[PDB]
């Protein structure tokens, strides 16, 4: 169901974090993810993986894999993405506007003072909700770009992911 896309998403995210952001698991993480709070977990194992580097390419890079991953989706799958934009981000959007609207959402949301100017190297994440298939638990990875800015885009993308499992 959604698992493939998430993995596929996660892989392009790391593949493109190296090829463009020039990062490595061995790279020193300026910011690191502390704890992952799910208010209602009904089948999701969420792990953090460090692909830290040094942010606009991180941001530009994460946008690429999302766009490419959305494009790969079957049009009849992709029709589900706008409902989860409204639910997860309170964004009004449609199939043809996904790439732009998300783009500007992350550009606008994640380039805000609250993000860049925050003094915590260990940042938490809170997620309302996440479901897993009975017997088949959704397994997801939070790629720690290493900067507030990049993690914001990761977060936004994770809020859409978890929202999908409903």
């Amino acid at each position: 169901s959604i698992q493939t896309t998430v993995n596929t998403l996660s892989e392009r995210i790391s593949s493109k974090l190296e090829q463009e952001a020039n990062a490595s698991a061995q790279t020193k993480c300026d910011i690191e993810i502390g704890n992952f709070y799910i208010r209602q977990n009904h089948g999701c194992n969420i792990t953090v993986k460090n692909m830290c580097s040094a942010a606009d390419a991180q941001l530009d890079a994460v946008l690429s894999a999302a766009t490419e991953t959305y494009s790969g989706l079957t049009p009849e799958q992709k029709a589900y993405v706008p409902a989860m934009f409204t639910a997860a981000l309170n964004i009004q959007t449609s199939v043809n506007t996904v790439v732009r609207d998300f783009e500007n959402y992350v550009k606008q949301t994640c380039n805000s003072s609250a993000v860049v100017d925050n003094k915590l190297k260990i940042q938490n994440v809170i997620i309302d909700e996440c479901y897993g298939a009975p017997g088949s638990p959704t397994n997801m990875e939070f790629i720690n770009t290493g900067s507030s800015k990049g993690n914001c885009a990761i977060k936004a993308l994770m809020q859409l992911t978890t929202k999908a499992t409903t």
Partner: antibody, heavy 123, light 108 residues
Framework: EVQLVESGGGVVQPGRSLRLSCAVS????????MHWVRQAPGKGLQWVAV????????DYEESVKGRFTISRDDSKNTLFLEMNTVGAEDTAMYYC????????????????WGQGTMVTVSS | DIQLTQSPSSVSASVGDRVTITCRAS??????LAWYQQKPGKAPKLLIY???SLQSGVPSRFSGSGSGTDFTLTISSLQPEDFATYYC?????????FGPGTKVDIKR
């Protein structure tokens, strides 16, 4: 019914250490997130720290991060707050509380409260 | 951090009065808001969760409402045992913060 019973309070000198205990009946800690909440004399309530159901993940209010350690002993179903570098700002009634959430959810509100244990930090 | 303010700072009532306390959050918190009751010398006790859900056992004359930034806690018919200080609390994000309290005393 869920019973939470704190102990360990007392008078303590600045910079030194203390351990508060909260004995819990009616519920297994492995099945509940847990918190500590303090109340300085004459003041409001302030959240201190949270321990996960798994007994190991944790978070802290900024002011006490580094100095306090929240943990538990499953064998005894007891929650603990280890206070190591106490200043007079830490004077307070310390309340052990339960997150209404269990091993698969978080609510971040506090449905059961202990009777309280008072810590006075003074020279 | 999320600041919670409470109005009125105090209130005096007779037994049977309708009493309403307000809690305003510095930022939107949806319905992640709870209210506690506390009496002198005693631990807080939870009354309302998720803005409008009454905690089991709590007398039916307590209710809450609101979502976003502005919330209310109403006692439809104050009873001698309701004279106490009331605190609201946000459950949206760390650190979990509390309002300053609103004391309800016996009118004379």
């Amino acid at each position: 019914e869920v019973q939470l019973v704190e102990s360990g309070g007392g008078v303590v000198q600045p910079g030194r250490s203390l351990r508060l205990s909260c004995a819990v009946s009616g519920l297994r800690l492995t099945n509940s997130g847990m918190h500590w909440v303090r109340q300085a004399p004459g003041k409001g309530l302030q959240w201190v720290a949270v321990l996960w159901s798994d007994g190991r993940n944790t978070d802290y209010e900024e002011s006490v991060k580094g100095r306090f350690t929240i943990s538990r002993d499953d064998s005894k179903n007891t929650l603990f707050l280890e206070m190591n570098t106490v200043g007079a700002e830490d004077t307070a009634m310390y309340y052990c509380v339960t997150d209404a959430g269990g091993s698969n959810s978080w609510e971040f509100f506090f449905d059961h409260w202990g009777q309280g244990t008072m810590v006075t930090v003074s020279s | 951090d999320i600041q919670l303010t409470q109005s009125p700072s105090s209130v005096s009532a007779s037994v049977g009065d309708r009493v309403t306390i307000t809690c305003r959050a510095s930022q939107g918190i949806s319905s992640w808001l709870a209210w506690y009751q506390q009496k002198p010398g005693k631990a807080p006790k939870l009354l309302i969760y998720a803005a409008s859900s009454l905690q089991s056992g709590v007398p039916s004359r307590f209710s809450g409402s609101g979502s976003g930034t502005d919330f209310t806690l109403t006692i439809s018919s104050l009873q001698p045992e309701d004279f106490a200080t009331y605190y609201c609390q946000q459950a949206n994000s760390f650190p979990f913060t509390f309002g300053p309290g609103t004391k309800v005393d016996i009118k004379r």
